[PDB]
Symmetry: C2
Subunit: 149 residues, 2 copies
């Protein structure tokens, strides 16, 4: 169903992020390509989280979360937090170590989004990793950017 729509979405390239939240010692991470900048003043970002995602209840309960932007070569991290377990992968400080960047947000709002919820975060803290190319998703697969030396 929705073949044409899905194909259109498969034609929108995007970076790959890992959204994480923790309540006490209960921490959950979730891979997401549906992420976008929203505002500068105040600093806001938005993302789509499935209504059936185990992350949602934890994120809403915590009232805060982090967003890590994955770099080239981090396919294993993306797969792991997408529900396909990988060895040696674990969140550190509530985020992904070695990512291009990390945004620590407090929950700003939750709006209806069909089978997903629109999650808006107010960025309170930012962490930047080393520079370099990003992990990209396009046409149902991980891709690389032309970024020669």
């Amino acid at each position: 169903m929705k073949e044409a729509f899905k194909e259109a979405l498969a034609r929108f390239a995007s970076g790959v992020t890992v959204v994480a939240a923790r309540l006490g010692e209960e921490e959950r991470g979730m891979t997401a390509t549906a992420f976008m900048s929203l505002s500068l003043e105040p600093p806001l970002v938005a993302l789509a989280v499935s209504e059936r995602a185990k992350l949602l209840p934890v994120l809403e309960g915590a009232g805060a979360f982090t967003v890590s932007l994955l770099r080239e070569g981090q396919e294993a991290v993306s797969e792991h937090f997408a529900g396909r377990p990988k060895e040696g992968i674990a969140l550190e400080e509530g985020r992904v170590k070695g990512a291009l960047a990390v945004l620590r947000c407090r929950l700003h709002a939750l709006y209806p989004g069909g089978d997903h919820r629109i999650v808006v975060g107010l960025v309170e803290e930012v962490e930047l990793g080393e520079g370099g190319p990003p992990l990209v998703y396009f046409q149902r697969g991980y891709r690389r950017l032309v970024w020669p030396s």
Copy 2:
């Protein structure tokens, strides 16, 4: 201000779209990288549109809009609808001709988003162009994907 935050956002790669709407005799197009898939059932997409954008009131009044996903080689189209005019660039049938895909949406819902407005569209029609690599934006510049892979 917000240097680290802006740098983090510059590290999220994305495709490039042109959002357009027509109200009466007024039609406007606007380049946007803040786009994301939102739901399958119903088929929804989300966009962040500047509260300063001339396109916003036209889109609100029309109750409908289009989203064109730009392909590699359409940098001039992106620049044009970003406010930097280019000779001969224009919308055709309310969208960008030769794009990778076009989504014709009914305005589903709107939400506050700081200095931007969250725009949710319900996809009613899909136009798919010929296959090929996309126009990508990353680190304050247009990039290309290593394609195929």
